[PDB]
Enzyme design. Structure first.
Site, mmCIF file in Angstrom:
data_model
loop_
_atom_site.group_PDB
_atom_site.id
_atom_site.type_symbol
_atom_site.label_atom_id
_atom_site.label_comp_id
_atom_site.label_asym_id
_atom_site.label_seq_id
_atom_site.Cartn_x
_atom_site.Cartn_y
_atom_site.Cartn_z
ATOM 1 N N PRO A 130 0.833 -1.203 0.000
ATOM 2 C CA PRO A 130 0.000 0.000 0.000
ATOM 3 C C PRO A 130 0.863 1.245 0.000
ATOM 4 C CG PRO A 130 0.067 -0.904 2.198
ATOM 5 C CD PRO A 130 0.804 -1.893 1.299
ATOM 6 N N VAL A 159 3.228 -4.046 -9.698
ATOM 7 C CA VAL A 159 4.024 -2.830 -9.502
ATOM 8 C C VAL A 159 5.168 -3.121 -8.538
ATOM 9 C CG1 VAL A 159 4.014 -0.386 -8.930
ATOM 10 C CG2 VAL A 159 1.917 -1.445 -9.875
ATOM 11 N N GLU A 192 4.043 -9.570 -12.997
ATOM 12 C CA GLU A 192 2.823 -10.134 -13.544
ATOM 13 C C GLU A 192 2.207 -9.102 -14.472
ATOM 14 O OE1 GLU A 192 1.822 -13.227 -13.789
ATOM 15 O OE2 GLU A 192 0.491 -12.160 -15.178
ATOM 16 N N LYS A 233 8.920 -3.354 -15.891
ATOM 17 C CA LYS A 233 7.506 -3.372 -15.508
ATOM 18 C C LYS A 233 7.017 -1.975 -15.135
ATOM 19 C CE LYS A 233 3.867 -5.892 -14.897
ATOM 20 N NZ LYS A 233 2.650 -5.081 -14.577
ATOM 21 N N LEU A 234 7.783 -1.251 -14.307
ATOM 22 C CA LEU A 234 7.376 0.104 -13.930
ATOM 23 C C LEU A 234 7.180 0.977 -15.168
ATOM 24 C CD1 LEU A 234 9.587 0.757 -10.751
ATOM 25 C CD2 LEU A 234 7.138 0.166 -10.883
ATOM 26 N N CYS A 239 -2.967 -0.682 -10.257
ATOM 27 C CA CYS A 239 -1.663 -0.639 -10.917
ATOM 28 C C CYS A 239 -1.236 0.765 -11.329
ATOM 29 C CB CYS A 239 -1.614 -1.546 -12.154
ATOM 30 S SG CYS A 239 -0.010 -1.558 -12.951
HETATM 31 O O1 LIG Z 1 2.056 -9.996 4.773
HETATM 32 C C1 LIG Z 1 1.096 -10.213 3.994
HETATM 33 C C2 LIG Z 1 0.519 -9.182 3.252
HETATM 34 C C3 LIG Z 1 -0.551 -9.455 2.408
HETATM 35 N N1 LIG Z 1 -1.003 -10.717 2.324
HETATM 36 C C4 LIG Z 1 -2.106 -11.043 1.422
HETATM 37 O O2 LIG Z 1 -1.697 -10.733 0.085
HETATM 38 C C5 LIG Z 1 -2.894 -10.622 -0.689
HETATM 39 C C6 LIG Z 1 -2.725 -9.511 -1.722
HETATM 40 O O3 LIG Z 1 -3.917 -9.520 -2.497
HETATM 41 P P1 LIG Z 1 -4.578 -8.161 -3.051
HETATM 42 O O4 LIG Z 1 -5.894 -8.553 -3.689
HETATM 43 O O5 LIG Z 1 -4.752 -7.170 -1.935
HETATM 44 O O6 LIG Z 1 -3.481 -7.539 -4.049
HETATM 45 P P2 LIG Z 1 -3.087 -8.003 -5.538
HETATM 46 O O7 LIG Z 1 -3.009 -9.503 -5.661
HETATM 47 O O8 LIG Z 1 -4.122 -7.428 -6.458
HETATM 48 O O9 LIG Z 1 -1.670 -7.294 -5.810
HETATM 49 C C7 LIG Z 1 -1.643 -6.195 -6.768
HETATM 50 O O10 LIG Z 1 -2.287 -5.024 -6.247
HETATM 51 C C8 LIG Z 1 -1.670 -4.634 -5.020
HETATM 52 C C9 LIG Z 1 -0.299 -4.045 -5.352
HETATM 53 O O11 LIG Z 1 0.333 -3.611 -4.142
HETATM 54 C C10 LIG Z 1 0.578 -5.041 -6.117
HETATM 55 O O12 LIG Z 1 1.652 -4.343 -6.788
HETATM 56 C C11 LIG Z 1 -0.227 -5.781 -7.193
HETATM 57 O O13 LIG Z 1 0.516 -6.923 -7.618
HETATM 58 C C12 LIG Z 1 -4.032 -10.282 0.272
HETATM 59 O O14 LIG Z 1 -5.102 -11.257 0.188
HETATM 60 C C13 LIG Z 1 -3.365 -10.224 1.642
HETATM 61 O O15 LIG Z 1 -4.174 -10.788 2.690
HETATM 62 C C14 LIG Z 1 -0.396 -11.741 3.082
HETATM 63 O O16 LIG Z 1 -0.797 -12.932 3.001
HETATM 64 N N2 LIG Z 1 0.629 -11.451 3.888
HETATM 65 O O1 LIG Z 2 -8.206 2.195 -23.618
HETATM 66 C C1 LIG Z 2 -8.319 2.109 -22.384
HETATM 67 C C2 LIG Z 2 -7.815 0.998 -21.682
HETATM 68 C C3 LIG Z 2 -7.977 0.948 -20.301
HETATM 69 N N1 LIG Z 2 -8.635 1.945 -19.677
HETATM 70 C C4 LIG Z 2 -8.809 1.946 -18.210
HETATM 71 O O2 LIG Z 2 -7.512 1.785 -17.614
HETATM 72 C C5 LIG Z 2 -7.622 1.084 -16.363
HETATM 73 C C6 LIG Z 2 -6.670 -0.106 -16.367
HETATM 74 O O3 LIG Z 2 -7.229 -1.089 -17.239
HETATM 75 P P1 LIG Z 2 -6.431 -2.419 -17.632
HETATM 76 O O4 LIG Z 2 -7.190 -3.188 -18.684
HETATM 77 O O5 LIG Z 2 -5.009 -2.144 -18.035
HETATM 78 O O6 LIG Z 2 -6.519 -3.326 -16.314
HETATM 79 P P2 LIG Z 2 -5.436 -3.547 -15.141
HETATM 80 O O7 LIG Z 2 -5.321 -2.307 -14.280
HETATM 81 O O8 LIG Z 2 -6.005 -4.715 -14.380
HETATM 82 O O9 LIG Z 2 -4.038 -3.985 -15.804
HETATM 83 C C7 LIG Z 2 -2.954 -3.073 -15.946
HETATM 84 O O10 LIG Z 2 -2.158 -3.039 -14.743
HETATM 85 C C8 LIG Z 2 -1.630 -4.318 -14.374
HETATM 86 C C9 LIG Z 2 -0.711 -4.761 -15.522
HETATM 87 O O11 LIG Z 2 -0.063 -6.004 -15.242
HETATM 88 C C10 LIG Z 2 -1.489 -4.872 -16.835
HETATM 89 O O12 LIG Z 2 -0.542 -5.224 -17.841
HETATM 90 C C11 LIG Z 2 -2.131 -3.518 -17.147
HETATM 91 O O13 LIG Z 2 -2.983 -3.569 -18.315
HETATM 92 C C12 LIG Z 2 -9.077 0.676 -16.223
HETATM 93 O O14 LIG Z 2 -9.715 1.644 -15.349
HETATM 94 C C13 LIG Z 2 -9.601 0.775 -17.656
HETATM 95 O O15 LIG Z 2 -11.014 0.978 -17.728
HETATM 96 C C14 LIG Z 2 -9.135 3.033 -20.414
HETATM 97 O O16 LIG Z 2 -9.728 3.968 -19.822
HETATM 98 N N2 LIG Z 2 -8.972 3.077 -21.749
#
Ligand SMILES: O=c1ccn([C@@H]2O[C@H](COP(=O)(O)OP(=O)(O)O[C@H]3OC[C@@H](O)[C@H](O)[C@H]3O)[C@@H](O)[C@H]2O)c(=O)[nH]1
Ligand SMILES: O=c1ccn([C@@H]2O[C@H](COP(=O)(O)OP(=O)(O)O[C@H]3OC[C@@H](O)[C@H](O)[C@H]3O)[C@@H](O)[C@H]2O)c(=O)[nH]1
Ligand SMILES: O=c1ccn([C@@H]2O[C@H](COP(=O)(O)OP(=O)(O)O[C@H]3OC[C@@H](O)[C@H](O)[C@H]3O)[C@@H](O)[C@H]2O)c(=O)[nH]1
Ligand SMILES: O=c1ccn([C@@H]2O[C@H](COP(=O)(O)OP(=O)(O)O[C@H]3OC[C@@H](O)[C@H](O)[C@H]3O)[C@@H](O)[C@H]2O)c(=O)[nH]1
Lengths: 132, 459, 460
Positions: free
Chosen positions: B93, B133, B162, B221-222, B277
């Site tokens: 976060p 990220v 990812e 990635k960034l 992201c």
């Molecule tokens: O110490 C920890 C921290 C977190 N967690 C778990 O890790 C999981 C993370 O799942 P989230 O749905 O919140 O996040 P994502 O899988 O979507 O990660 C994504 O969005 C959050 C960003 O910070 C990351 O860069 C991105 O990969 C949670 O279910 C949380 O409970 C642990 O098990 N241990």
């Molecule tokens: O043409 C577009 C495409 C996307 N979007 C918006 O942009 C936001 C991101 O949409 P994405 O389809 O990229 O969805 P995500 O955020 O899940 O994935 C994004 O971040 C995580 C990375 O690993 C993915 O490669 C990247 O696409 C959404 O709010 C979507 O509605 C637009 O407004 N216009």
């Protein structure tokens, strides 16, 4: 957890007026650090007043330690802000054993110069003012 | 000398960890994959007929593997102890205080995972950070491992970002454009990299697997995320220019996108991008650049966020202006709360920001989304919520007696609503604000019915 | 209904010349006459040595010229007989007044429109074709609407040109799309269809887009800006790579494999040049400010600010490597064109890098295989500083002889084939190579073994 060794504004006094220890402690409190503060002469209550704005942030984050080994027990870092002579005579092997790793010493006073080889061999990351 | 991964542990059962490990298990029947999490209700949901996230096709993937070689568990310690490969896929976060407040990622959960791994590990293991990220993630893990050695403990750190997009996660994971793996340029690092490559080669052609060092992996990635967000902000900036000059951003986007050097993807103007992201990614890129004394690069990428914030504000003020700058006690339907279609995820959804702008004007919002849980909408919008926000069970209830219908998420069902029925029960003038261009081609019918239609990038 | 049989193009430049040559090549039954006020340019188009360098252009011109392709200084008669008149002239940036240094000056477009009215009767289609159209169709219509004649019926179209210099012929023969804007009236659509019928001699119908004139011009302004932005974006990453030990070419590969991003226009460089990109973004920013869209204006301004920073950072790396004194040091500049395979220098980064080094007192020896010597002199003049500091070399070994540093600013393919062992023997030491184009990648080991200090963009 972070140990603050030294709260007086210089050694051999209990005076804290404008001590750098106050400012360093407040910067770490703004980051959510759990400070454990040791000073051989500053009264406990003065530290509480100095770190307050009955302060809730002080309640959550600040501990006043009765000895420096308690302040360092489980600490990530030891921050030396006052050049009390007793700080260079501490048992740093014992401190290192109970610190979390990596274990940092931030010497804000150059009081540990010449112990650097010993401290690195023990396993500390030593950072000091005016040197890498 | 090499290493074969036979057991995988993934710490983090979220939008990244759950789907990714489910596809790995699906594609590698001889590998045991255990997904673990501190959140017990989330783990229970993964083991139930109702998964904790909505992803098309995910239920079928999970149910083909779960209990054979795919497992979901709260026993983090035993999963690590037995793993050959440990993924770390947790959330980072944004800091809410201190240096970089509101901008810099907080690595505390990554660091706690690294410490937990040392505690529960003996022998050799590969530890791979996988997130959308990654912000100095591999480095912080290595720092913990370098400082906490044991006899015969030998941990290797890889980066494996990812690239999946939510809502298309399963298709993206099964046919990725590329897989990116970073590891050390040492014999140990290359052995670990090859081991992870061998997992992906069960279903990804080798020519689509890129290998590099950990920092180049994370920086790639960034940057890639920021390029994607920049395309959206760029076409959104053009949408404002179209509105001011009588052009249509969808037609301009088509002409732009036919240049094969530009490509025709990610040129769909919108109320503004959301998701966990993009904004986080650009904020962290800007913060990193400031820390490196690169202020020109920082202010360059900052424009991607500034434009997104302006696009949202401009959309909200069009709604308020159309309602003649008083919306006190006016009912307004919000159709769509997820940050994009085909997910229940709301993180940084533009629907949150539009709703709050309207709540600050005293609007009575009735919010409908086919997949976002009611309680999440309440949390996202938090006394003001109690007074102003209603969560509707269906879109006709949200629109009944409304002054305006605001479409914030491009769910396909919105273009199929009975808009003649909606018009009958709205107050007049009845506005539709299409923040997603989903009602294009219905404009004649909607005008004939009697709506005032306003959409992004056209006037 | 209406068939274009005679075409006149006002402007025999990088746009008008190649475009009309290809039209003539693909439409043997259409007479194409290119006209220009510049007599020496017209004479060169009619000679064995064309006035611009474009791969393949000489072959196209010589297969058509004198058959259905003509170059002439007789502007009036070419207009009088034309069915279709292209306007493909330059719109320089204003040098004073409102928008000085930023806004386009439409005086040549307007002068063309007045000249067309003076020399026209009956029906004609007038089509503005440029790489950066800035209110061009509107200004032509403004003139035509105010200067009517009985039975004079001029139709105004927009037809932006997407070719890139150095690949003009291939781009014109297989365009990604053709974009034509005209009025949404019966007469406007009749005119659009007539121009479509020309392009359909060699362009499939599904690649021809038709719209109104403003949408056409806005689409071009935006498309150019998206391209320029990709370069500034990858150049910003190149600075981040240099600061952190990564390689921008590897990062670019990873980025470009996303099919939603695409893998083109991700080649980091000393900075983009050319008569299109900077002018296009400056005019887009100026238009946005005039429409009270300051957020959009400052969004696109970053594309230019980053490009300016990229050039400045490259020059100061050179100066730092020479320990911040360059007085009387010989430095070779390899490449003056704004990209390879053209003699065009407009807004070339080589001009800016050269000027930064001249401000340090460097003695520059400049080599380019196609840029004319006199053009380099003009580009680097405000005169006395050029006289003292600038030498134009006829071969690259002369430019490097006794040099402290070699600066590659243009990606001419011949530069990777130079005899760098010979070059090193006669350079002063330490001998630096500053590769502003990544053309020497993979030679780094050889060059380091020879003894060079190699510095390149996006790698430290
Ligand atoms: O110490 C920890 C921290 C977190 N967690 C778990 O890790 C999981 C993370 O799942 P989230 O749905 O919140 O996040 P994502 O899988 O979507 O990660 C994504 O969005 C959050 C960003 O910070 C990351 O860069 C991105 O990969 C949670 O279910 C949380 O409970 C642990 O098990 N241990
Ligand atoms: O043409 C577009 C495409 C996307 N979007 C918006 O942009 C936001 C991101 O949409 P994405 O389809 O990229 O969805 P995500 O955020 O899940 O994935 C994004 O971040 C995580 C990375 O690993 C993915 O490669 C990247 O696409 C959404 O709010 C979507 O509605 C637009 O407004 N216009
Ligand atoms: O009134 C005029 C003005 C100009 N001209 C001629 O028009 C020709 C323009 O050719 P240039 O090589 O200068 O310009 P280009 O063909 O490359 O145009 C391109 O660069 C200039 C930009 O302003 C344009 O947007 C772009 O299309 C010149 O040869 C000039 O002599 C006229 O014949 N009449
Ligand atoms: O990846 C790249 C691509 C291009 N460049 C530079 O960007 C500048 C522009 O190069 P281009 O290939 O686009 O050539 P041009 O400027 O002639 O054409 C450009 O403007 C005119 C439009 O009609 C074309 O569609 C557009 O490509 C050059 O200085 C080039 O060296 C990079 O630095 N990196």
């Amino acid at each position: 957890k972070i140990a603050i060794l030294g709260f007086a504004f210089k050694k051999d006094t209990g005076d804290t007026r404008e001590s750098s220890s106050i400012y360093i402690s407040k910067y770490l409190m703004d980051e959510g650090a759990h400070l454990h503060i040791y000073d051989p002469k500053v009264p406990r209550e003065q530290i509480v007043v100095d770190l307050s704005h009955e302060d809730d942030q002080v309640s959550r984050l600040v501990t006043i330690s009765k000895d420096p080994y308690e302040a360092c027990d489980g600490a990530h870092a030891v921050v030396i802000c006052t050049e009390w002579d007793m700080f260079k005579e501490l048992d740093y092997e014992r401190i290192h054993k109970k610190m979390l790793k990596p274990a940092f010493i931030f010497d804000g006073r150059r009081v540990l110069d010449g112990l650097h080889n010993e401290l690195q061999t023990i396993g500390f990351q030593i950072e000091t003012i005016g040197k890498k | 000398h090499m290493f074969e991964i036979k057991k995988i542990c993934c710490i983090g059962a979220g939008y990244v960890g759950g789907p990714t490990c489910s596809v790995i298990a699906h594609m590698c029947p001889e590998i045991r994959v255990t997904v673990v999490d501190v959140n017990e209700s989330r783990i229970n949901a993964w083991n139930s007929p109702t998964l904790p996230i909505y992803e098309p096709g995910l239920k079928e993937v999970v149910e083909s593997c779960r209990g054979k070689n795919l497992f979901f568990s709260t026993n983090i310690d035993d999963a690590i102890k037995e793993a050959d490969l440990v993924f770390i896929s947790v959330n980072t976060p944004t800091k809410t205080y201190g240096m970089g407040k509101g901008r810099a990622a907080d690595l505390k959960y990554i660091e706690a995972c690294a410490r937990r791994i040392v505690q529960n590990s003996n022998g050799y293991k590969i530890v791979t950070e996988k997130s959308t990220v990654p912000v100095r993630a591999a480095e912080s893990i290595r720092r913990i491992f370098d400082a906490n050695t044991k006899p015969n403990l030998n941990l290797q750190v890889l980066s494996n970002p990812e690239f999946l997009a939510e809502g298309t996660a399963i298709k993206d994971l099964k046919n990725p454009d590329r897989v990116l793996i970073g590891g050390d340029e040492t014999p140990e690092g290359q052995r670990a990299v090859q081991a992870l490559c061998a997992v992906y080669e069960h279903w990804v052609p080798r020519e689509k697997i890129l290998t590099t060092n950990t920092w180049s992996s994370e920086l790639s990635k960034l940057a890639a995320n920021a390029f994607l967000a920049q395309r959206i902000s760029s076409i959104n900036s053009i949408s404002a220019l179209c509105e001011a000059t009588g052009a249509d951003v969808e037609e301009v986007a088509t002409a732009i996108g036919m240049d094969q050097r530009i490509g025709n993807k990610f040129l769909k103007a919108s109320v503004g991008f959301g998701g966990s992201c993009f904004q986080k990614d650009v904020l962290n890129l800007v913060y990193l650049c400031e820390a490196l004394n690169l202020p020109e690069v920082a202010r360059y990428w900052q424009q991607v966020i500034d434009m997104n914030d302006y696009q949202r504000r401009r959309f909200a003020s069009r709604i308020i202006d159309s309602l003649f700058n008083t919306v006190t006690d006016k009912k307004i339907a919000i159709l769509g709360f997820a940050f994009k279609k085909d997910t229940g995820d709301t993180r940084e959804s533009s629907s949150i920001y539009i709703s709050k702008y309207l709540m600050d004007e005293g609007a009575h919002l009735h919010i409908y989304d086919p997949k976002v849980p009611r309680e999440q909408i309440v949390v996202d919008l938090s006394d003001q919520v109690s007074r102003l926000v209603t969560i509707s069970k269906d879109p006709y209830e949200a629109c009944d007696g409304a002054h305006a219908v605001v479409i914030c998420t491009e769910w396909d069902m919105f273009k199929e609503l009975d808009y003649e029925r909606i018009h009958k029960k709205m107050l007049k003038p009845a506005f539709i604000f299409d923040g997603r261009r989903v009602l294009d081609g219905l404009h004649n019918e909607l005008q004939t019915i009697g709506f005032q239609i306003e959409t992004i990038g056209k006037k």
